[PDB]
């Protein structure tokens, strides 16, 4: 009976990740009419075309000068030696006028993406963050209302009701004519997905009792890893975003075919300090885990192999966490895992020349360190806390976590313009600070 749950988890997995494949930024330069005619007339080499015609000149910096400028000259009606065409028209850099790119952009890719189709390249670069912001806002708004809708009609109709919109919205997004409809369909699809996956979690975990719940708590990570791995194969044979979206949508279609309370929890001065430390590490780890994947998906030399390798090293983290639960206290693995995350980034900021060989080893270590630190919190939660039925307090806490997750893409993307290695300092600071707070957890009054 686990096949259904595994399929549902593997279908949910690409939703939070698909921005890596659906939208990517290839190397571009805007179109200047008059160079293609000269290229075909004089037999200009295509590889060396961007050496005598590009306005970026020096590759260092020049983000605006290379991708958002043109050498506005009279390419036609001009006689040239067909060696250095600009050696006589201008005879000097910065002594001839520039301007904004007008006709369009020429991209270097065999496939297509959202950036290529809608031209979010020069001054609309901030429009790409709306893609994740709308999904996170839908995740935020879906938590509050999913409880109310399931009461008046029961859980039988709700589960079937919310597994059809997730496919219809995907198909319609694959058949979208303009940009705003994509955002509307993205929000409508993200309203219900987290609630569906959360309901499936409990539906799968109903049968498992003591011990069995722990054993099946890792099968739901194994299925997530399997779904993450199987997505890299589809993006290799379908290099068009419409085709990939239509190929990952229809599976779901065929798939469907006195008492404990938050009041007692806070007045006691010993159970009040323990939770303000446990509900902050979760926020920090979620922020780091969300940010690292998006950072990797923007500066990867070869995206297909790094993404494949970043799960075969995430697999043994659960095994290590399950190994180290019996013979070792609960704060040493947490402290070590939180310390391993900061040092990885602190070294990543400093390896310039031979970074390509060492990144696939260091980032895997960082991913493993983050993966270990999340399972321990869940195990402690299961061990120590009772069975709360359903609480507006937990609902508000999840809403606040989604509020925190909404802001992250803007800071991740828009802070990289000032300096390339600036977002890798906040992560290190958060990781190093989250290791010094876990040392206040042990009770110092009469511990022995």
């Amino acid at each position: 009976a686990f096949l259904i749950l595994c399929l549902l988890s593997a279908a949910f997995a690409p939703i939070c990740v698909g921005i890596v494949f659906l939208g990517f930024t290839p190397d571009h330069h805007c179109q200047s009419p008059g160079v293609a005619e000269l290229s075909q007339r004089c037999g200009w080499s295509p590889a060396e075309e961007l050496n005598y015609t590009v306005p970026g000149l020096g590759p260092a910096g020049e983000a605006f000068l290379g991708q958002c400028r043109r050498y506005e000259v009279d390419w036609n009606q001009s006689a040239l030696s067909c060696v250095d065409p600009l050696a006589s028209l201008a005879t000097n850099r910065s002594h001839l006028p520039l301007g904004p790119c007008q006709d369009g952009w020429v991209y270097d890719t065999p496939g297509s993406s959202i950036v290529t189709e809608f031209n979010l390249v020069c001054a609309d670069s901030w429009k790409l963050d709306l893609f994740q912001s709308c999904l996170n806002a839908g995740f935020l708004f879906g938590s509050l209302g999913v409880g109310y809708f399931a009461d008046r009609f029961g859980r039988k109709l709700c589960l079937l009701g919310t597994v059809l919109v997730n496919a219809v919205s995907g198909v319609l997004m694959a058949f979208s004519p303009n940009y705003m409809s994509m955002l509307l369909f993205r929000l409508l699809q993200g309203l219900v997905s987290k609630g569906n996956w959360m309901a499936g979690y409990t539906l799968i975990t109903e049968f498992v009792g003591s011990g069995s719940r722990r054993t099946v708590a890792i099968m739901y990570q194994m299925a997530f890893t399997v779904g993450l791995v199987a997505l890299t194969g589809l993006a290799y044979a379908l290099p068009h975003w419409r085709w990939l979206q239509l190929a990952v949508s229809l599976p779901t279609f065929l798939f469907l075919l006195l008492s404990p309370s938050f009041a007692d929890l806070f007045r006691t001065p010993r159970l009040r300090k323990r939770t303000f430390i446990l509900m902050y590490l979760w926020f920090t780890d979620s922020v780091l885990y969300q940010g690292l994947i998006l950072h990797m998906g923007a500066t990867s030399g070869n995206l297909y192999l790094d993404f494949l390798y970043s799960a075969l090293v995430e697999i043994p983290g659960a095994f290590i966490a399950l190994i180290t639960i019996d013979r070792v206290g609960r704060i040493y693995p947490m402290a070590m895992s939180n310390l391993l995350a900061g040092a990885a980034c602190l070294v990543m900021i400093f390896i310039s020349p031979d970074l390509h060989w060492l990144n696939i080893i260091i980032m895997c270590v960082g991913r493993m360190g983050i993966t270990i630190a999340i399972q321990m919190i869940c195990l402690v939660n299961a061990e120590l806390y009772p069975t709360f039925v359903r609480n507006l307090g937990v609902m508000v806490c999840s809403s606040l976590c989604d509020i925190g997750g909404i802001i992250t893409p803007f800071i991740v993307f828009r802070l990289r313009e000032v300096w390339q290695a600036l977002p890798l300092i906040l992560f290190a600071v958060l990781g190093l600070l989250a290791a010094g707070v876990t040392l206040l957890l042990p009770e110092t009054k009469g511990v022995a």
Partner: nanobody
Framework: QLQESGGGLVQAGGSLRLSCAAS????????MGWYRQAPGKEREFVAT???????NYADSVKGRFTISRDNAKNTVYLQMNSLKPEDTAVYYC????????????????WGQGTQVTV
């Protein structure tokens, strides 16, 4: 506030039931256990239980002792059958500290226990 009960005298291969009474605050958010004094020796370890229901046991007493949790009476039970002659000591109810040590050898509570003999 921990309080133990039960105890008595047995001849050979008997059965008796112990009981640890909690306060209500420590019942839901803590972990309970049982420790054996073993006079003339350091204190021993028997079994634990947590909120999920996962139980641990000692190798010497495995297959003989059974621990169960009761929610209506706010008590933690322990059943001992077919007692060996070595099983003779006073038994303490304790609340171990998970975050420090090996997880079951640091105590922050006790209840002074009760005596049993064979």
């Amino acid at each position: 506030q921990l309080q133990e009960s039960g105890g008595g005298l047995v001849q050979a291969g008997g059965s008796l039931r112990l009981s640890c009474a909690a306060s209500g605050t420590i019942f839901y958010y803590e972990i309970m256990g049982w420790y054996r004094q073993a006079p003339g020796k350091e204190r021993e370890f028997v079994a634990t239980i947590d909120q999920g229901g996962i139980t641990n046991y000692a190798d010497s007493v495995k297959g003989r002792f059974t621990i169960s949790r009761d929610n209506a009476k706010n008590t933690v039970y322990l059943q001992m059958n077919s007692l060996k002659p070595e099983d003779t000591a006073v038994y303490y109810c304790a609340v171990p500290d998970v975050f420090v040590g090996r997880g079951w050898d640091y105590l922050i509570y006790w209840g002074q226990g009760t005596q049993v003999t064979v």
